[PDB]
């Protein structure tokens, strides 16, 4: 389930040695977003509402505000902040260890929807060196 990875990986990430924190809380906002916009697509608006006020403060105000206003399908297909996030790749840059670290991570925990989630909506730049 959607929520309770999201948890999982926030939980171990907020673990993590200070020195991949800085390269792995990016990723919250951007998934948090698609588990909100996945919530609304499975017309589940009321769990989509919650889960947004829970986490909307773990990371951006400006574009939460906008976001908060999107309860429903249409809402996502008439904004188009909306409607480009959902169809179009987030870039995220990340060093090679805290890559490694999390893929690690979601691969142990089969965490398979997060990993749907960064091959079809994620754009990581790993640097190497």
């Not at 906002?29 to 909100?36: A, G, K």
């Not at 480009?84 to 691969?107: C, Q, V, W």
Request: negative net charge; without cysteine.
């Amino acid at each position: 389930q959607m929520e309770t990875s999201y948890v999982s990986l926030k939980t171990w990430i907020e673990d993590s040695l200070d020195l991949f924190k800085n390269d792995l809380l990016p990723l919250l906002y951007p998934l948090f977003i698609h588990i909100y916009f996945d919530l609304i697509q499975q017309n589940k608006t009321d769990e989509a509402k919650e889960f947004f006020e829970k986490y909307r403060g773990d990371h951006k105000s400006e574009e939460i505000k906008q976001f908060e206003s999107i309860y429903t399908v249409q809402h996502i297909h008439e904004n188009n902040f909306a409607y480009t996030f959902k169809n179009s790749k987030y870039h995220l840059s990340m060093g090679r260890y805290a890559f490694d670290l999390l893929i690690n991570f979601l691969e142990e925990r089969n965490l398979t929807y997060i990993l749907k989630i960064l091959n079809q909506h994620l754009d990581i730049k790993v640097y190497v060196g």
